[PDB]
Ligand binder design. Structure first.
Ligand SMILES: COc1c(N)c(F)cc(C(=O)N[C@H]2CCC(=O)NC2=O)c1F
Ligand SMILES: COc1c(N)c(F)cc(C(=O)N[C@H]2CCC(=O)NC2=O)c1F
Ligand SMILES: [Zn+2]
Ligand SMILES: [Zn+2]
Ligand SMILES: [Zn+2]
Lengths: 104, 97, 105
């Protein structure tokens, strides 16, 4: 039921907050450095630090601008916060294998 | 971020947005993208008409030629166009050019 | 052609053919109530383990299943857990990937 940072245990999200974007909470994507990510979309997250200013370049999600989301505790790259869009205006795409799932 | 399509499992290049030709379908128990062209698949078996979602086309199984994952089907025997590829959205990764 | 062996003693435990995508993936990163973090791979079957204890539903990572601790039957290394009492499948194993060694049949 709760998602923590796999590296340090920082509280990040919850299964209840998963968000099916275009029909599915899970999206498999690659960046221009050819890294493949299994991204889980969440309506809400906490315990992150969002770094820099949003950018629309290479956005996987139509109409959204992204900011890099680090673990606020350990600094590990956990995914991205998306904004600037519609329905919803904002959400988080977190890298599923950087999280640890467990009891509430 | 979404002009090239690759195998989800291993990252083999399969197709591109320029070749798109999102059908939601039900097998007899998918969000399929149709493409005019693809690469890096291996098409296996003999074409079959059984439960073909596309009227007048027979299908052949399309595997990723790099790792063997099942990515969708190749359709032949129809008209306008004669042939195309129907790939399973959830088996692809999307990314930049 | 791939089997998983106990990393400590070499006993054959499971097969790659038996990898099971529970909730969409065979790999789950999980944490127990003492905050220990494990990277678990799900298999339908296994062999050469010894399940200890009565099944328990408390804190199960997989809803609708009870768990029992699974040790290597040969050397006693803690390799994961067995799950039972659910449906489709009724039972399966969550094994600690870092405590296995994968290799040819
Ligand atoms: C700006 O060039 C880069 C470089 N050079 C990079 F090394 C990595 C990225 C990167 O991971 N971007 C993600 C951000 C989130 C999104 O939705 N799509 C992406 O593709 C990137 F954009
Ligand atoms: C009963 O309190 C404990 C203590 N004290 C412990 F030190 C470890 C565990 C433990 O590892 N539990 C696993 C069992 C397998 C599963 O699916 N979920 C878990 O959370 C545990 F439950
Ligand atoms: Zn962290
Ligand atoms: Zn592949
Ligand atoms: Zn052993």
């Amino acid at each position: 039921s709760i998602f923590r940072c796999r590296q340090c245990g920082q509280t990040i999200s919850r299964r209840d907050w998963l968000l099916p974007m275009g029909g599915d909470h899970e999206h498999v994507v690659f960046n221009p450095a050819g890294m493949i990510f299994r991204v889980w979309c969440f309506s809400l997250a906490q315990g992150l630090r969002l770094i820099g200013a949003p950018s629309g370049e290479f956005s996987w999600f139509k109409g959204y601008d992204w900011t890099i989301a680090l673990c606020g505790q350990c600094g590990s790259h956990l995914g991205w916060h998306y904004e600037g869009g519609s329905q919803p205006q904002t959400f988080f795409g977190l890298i599923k294998d950087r999280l640890a799932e467990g009891p509430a």
